[PDB]
Amino acid sequence: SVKGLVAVITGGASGLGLSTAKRLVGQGATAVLLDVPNSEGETEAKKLGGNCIFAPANVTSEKEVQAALTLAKEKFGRIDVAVNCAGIAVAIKTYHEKKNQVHTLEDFQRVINVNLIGTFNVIRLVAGVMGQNEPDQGGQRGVIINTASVAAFEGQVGQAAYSASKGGIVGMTLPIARDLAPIGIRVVTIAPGLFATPLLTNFLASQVPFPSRLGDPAEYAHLVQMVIENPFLNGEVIRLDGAIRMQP
Amino acid sequence: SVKGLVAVITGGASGLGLSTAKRLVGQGATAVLLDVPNSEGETEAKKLGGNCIFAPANVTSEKEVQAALTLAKEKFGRIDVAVNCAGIAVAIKTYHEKKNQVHTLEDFQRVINVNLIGTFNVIRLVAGVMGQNEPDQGGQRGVIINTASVAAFEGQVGQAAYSASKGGIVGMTLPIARDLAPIGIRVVTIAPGLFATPLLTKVRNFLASQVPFPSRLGDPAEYAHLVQMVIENPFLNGEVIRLDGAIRMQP
Amino acid sequence: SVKGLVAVITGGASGLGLSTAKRLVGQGATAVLLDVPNSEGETEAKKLGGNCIFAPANVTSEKEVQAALTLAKEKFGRIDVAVNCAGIAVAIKTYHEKKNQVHTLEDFQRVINVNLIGTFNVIRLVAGVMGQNEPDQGGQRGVIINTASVAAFEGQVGQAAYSASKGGIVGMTLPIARDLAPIGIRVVTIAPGLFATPLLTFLASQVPFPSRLGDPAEYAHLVQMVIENPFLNGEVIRLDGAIRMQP
Amino acid sequence: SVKGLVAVITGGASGLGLSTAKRLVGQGATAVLLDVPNSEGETEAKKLGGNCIFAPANVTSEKEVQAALTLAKEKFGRIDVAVNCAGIAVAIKTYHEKKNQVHTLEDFQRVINVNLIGTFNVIRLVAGVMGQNEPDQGGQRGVIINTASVAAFEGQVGQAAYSASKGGIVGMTLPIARDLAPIGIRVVTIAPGLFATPLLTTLPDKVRNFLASQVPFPSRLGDPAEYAHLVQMVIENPFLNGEVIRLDGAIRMQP
Ligand SMILES: NC(=O)c1ccc[n+]([C@@H]2O[C@H](COP(=O)([O-])OP(=O)(O)OC[C@H]3O[C@@H](n4cnc5c(N)ncnc54)[C@H](O)[C@@H]3O)[C@@H](O)[C@H]2O)c1
Ligand SMILES: NC(=O)c1ccc[n+]([C@@H]2O[C@H](COP(=O)([O-])OP(=O)(O)OC[C@H]3O[C@@H](n4cnc5c(N)ncnc54)[C@H](O)[C@@H]3O)[C@@H](O)[C@H]2O)c1
Ligand SMILES: NC(=O)c1ccc[n+]([C@@H]2O[C@H](COP(=O)([O-])OP(=O)(O)OC[C@H]3O[C@@H](n4cnc5c(N)ncnc54)[C@H](O)[C@@H]3O)[C@@H](O)[C@H]2O)c1
Ligand SMILES: NC(=O)c1ccc[n+]([C@@H]2O[C@H](COP(=O)([O-])OP(=O)(O)OC[C@H]3O[C@@H](n4cnc5c(N)ncnc54)[C@H](O)[C@@H]3O)[C@@H](O)[C@H]2O)c1
Ligand SMILES: C[C@]12CC[C@@H]3c4ccc(O)cc4CC[C@H]3C1CC[C@H]2O
Q: Where is NAD(+) annotated to bind (chain B)?
């Protein structure tokens, strides 16, 4: 079970991070929603009660994310779980002939900065916080769960920046679990296929073999709970995608 | 929840299949252990209670497999889940220079027949049974879970036959989930690393000294919780999951 | 250069294996085409001249492959390379709901026996032949090249038996290269996408670029590069124009 | 044959990039070495002769890469091949328990910026230059080859930034090949295991000397010329695309 664990969930005001937060608070854990100030984190935290607060922060900022973890530890006393769901996406070709338009450097930089350098910023700063915990009966001090994408394996036309960023998450999964193994922190990544969140904001659903529909955010939340409960899952990437494989 | 579902677990008399049956029965499901007659199957299904029975069958036998699935459908009315855990292992080099010995073809064939063809034999026969189920609210008629190994990806010296059989399992997982998509049967494969079973249990704790964290052999109850997650989560399909403590196997 | 080398190519009377044999003989190597007695192996070997012979053998047969390897080692003096291209395909659903048809166990067993058990049978018995060679200046005594398929990774509807056999090839590539490391035999597998051969001849249209079936001479070119590069080992290479298969 | 093709090779003053230049120019091609100003660039470009020039440039700069490409296009008339070998490595734990030291954010940012954003900078700006060429008999306009690493799959302890940069190169290889398919530009990535280049001084020392033993066969560090031979194979084979090839002796990295 996850009752009594404290989880910091980035991207927690919407979509997969918010559904994760609803499932873990409903199972008895406490959840901090780390999300930008312009989001609706504060209200969603209120709707989930006193065991779920909002920590406004941008994950590309060291000082903000350090302030958000300080808040979580001060309120709830420790951090057991982190879930990285903050992320953005763009759909721009590397070079579009017709328009003779190269993809800009700054649009690639921005997607790398939020998705991959923002996930590594959270990881590096929560790892020292979970390192303070007394190890449980099996030597574990924490679990860190990241969100990649099937775009890390079958990135479509227009997804070079998003793919680069999520393949970076996938490539650092095993070296960060091997770095944190001596202090008992597992590191696992989930790679969702196509899910019903805002991030889509009209024919995507038909491509999915079975179930033949977009994923429900609550199914990502149930895998997150399984990942936190299973003590031997480590250093691995799970696809959650209805058996889809993306075409160009 | 798995309360009420009927699962047939091949390899259910020992190790990972037996720990899966104990967890699923302790959570309210029914379980049929499918394992060879010599095994401890009968005893185990007795110690597990009236919601678990033993169906003697060798998975390389179409007739025996089909008889066990029919027993299950007779006793319990339907089959909702199948978990393939029957398997064998050998440690024989392709060519051993000290000995001057070449791996026999029959010792490769044997591993391939139990591990690979025997999992396909159970899959193909249980798909037609699950296809008799009424689809649930979300279109689902059944879930098939196979057990490969990390050896499908990092086979060590000595594991050509075992690696070939487990890579065959991994390679057929997506085309079988695509074949079954129209009738709502999910197909997922779990690839354990090293586990404390009557396959493993100085030769063994050297192996457990290589696991990053937790630093020890897997406990079969951890494989059984992964199998419960895979039954419960409706969107996991056509994928292979490593369950191994972050180990990568050296030669 | 592959000049001088002796290769045994299973499935060499047709498609990929024959194009590979044309290229390697054209570059000065010797080739032994290992194929079933009913194929056109004798004529194909005759057309390539006296540096190319036919050794009729089914790769599932331990007696037949040992006699064809022995013919190669006697005729040419040694075996430096083995290319596994012998292979068959089927298109059968696991369970077909409209006809209420279960895939038969025999059709799955026959594809695994030719493609997977046959490729291991050639590897296991050519290894000890190559083990007789004096190592070259970098320790090498031989190179073994197997043929899998993109179906090991994106198997389509109807390909459960073929994907199982090609996923078995990929799976065993690294342990046999580990096994053979002490005697200097490299082991590499190619996973082609779709190639214009008698196994095949809108599939073409799905390949990003170039948008067409592959040409068997491009597979032959990638085989020569794997024979020439001393550091490629224990790896599977996709040769597929960037195709990813849909159901 | 590579004869008469024009190749721009980033990181071309040393290691893999230089040995790749040496091989292509030995085989009849022209090569531009794109490397920083403080490297041996200019002297290598001289030793390699009249069909090899140095364009000093940092791959992280739009302006410098655009200028180096323009010089190649002005001086040889076209660009047929691009080879990304510019790269840096670091060995830093995400969080060090003994020393109680966290990996800095700017050290991870610097390796992602050189290795991954610097490789996409060159791709996107060379793509349009290759797109000026007329298509060959088979529809091809150019080939782009990138260098990742087996760290993209088995990153060791200390390699979080390096692995994240290299796994990002692997992750983008297919979407870029798909993006560039209409114009006939293949995109392939090579993931080298451990090679005898000057980069090697990144490992402990009590690590480095031992490396060879881990390599199954041949049981040694890779020779840079072996990397160069695989690059020529990728240039020549018209059907390789969208794929990553390990070149590593069958090694699998332990922690
Ligand atoms: N929905 C899908 O189909 C899908 C598929 C695959 C992967 N993903 C990944 O799932 C994760 C969650 O996305 P989602 O679908 O829930 O979308 P979402 O847009 O609903 O939620 C993303 C949340 O991340 C927050 N966020 C963005 N930038 C941030 C920053 N710099 N700092 C802090 N918060 C920031 C947003 O404000 C938002 O509340 C993302 O990493 C996305 O890439 C989503
Ligand atoms: N234990 C590990 O470290 C480990 C690691 C990876 C994968 N695995 C895989 O896990 C699965 C379960 O193995 P385990 O460790 O529990 O071993 P186990 O020996 O304890 O259990 C295997 C069961 O399979 C049954 N079996 C063997 N051949 C059979 C046949 N033809 N027909 C029916 N039953 C047959 C055996 O009688 C035994 O009861 C196997 O597929 C094995 O390859 C195990
Ligand atoms: N052509 C494609 O699109 C494609 C794609 C991926 C993989 N492949 C694989 O490439 C390989 C080459 O096939 P191809 O396309 O050249 O087909 P092909 O039919 O033209 O040739 C295969 C050769 O194998 C021989 N062979 C079959 N069974 C044999 C047996 N038991 N013993 C000895 N020889 C036997 C056949 O007689 C034939 O001459 C096979 O392994 C195939 O599975 C082909
Ligand atoms: N040597 C190995 O074992 C090894 C293994 C795997 C991958 N790699 C990768 O191989 C590629 C080549 O490395 P190498 O071993 O030749 O190392 P190297 O240090 O000898 O050469 C790399 C070159 O890249 C140049 N470079 C660095 N940053 C640059 C920048 N911002 N702009 C332009 N040039 C820049 C350096 O000046 C150097 O000349 C790198 O991407 C490296 O990560 C090397
Ligand atoms: C950015 C995503 C992949 C690219 C997708 C796309 C890309 C192009 C397009 O026209 C529509 C869509 C809809 C859903 C998008 C996405 C939601 C899931 C995600 O990862």
A: 14, 16, 35, 59, 85, 162, 166, 195, 197
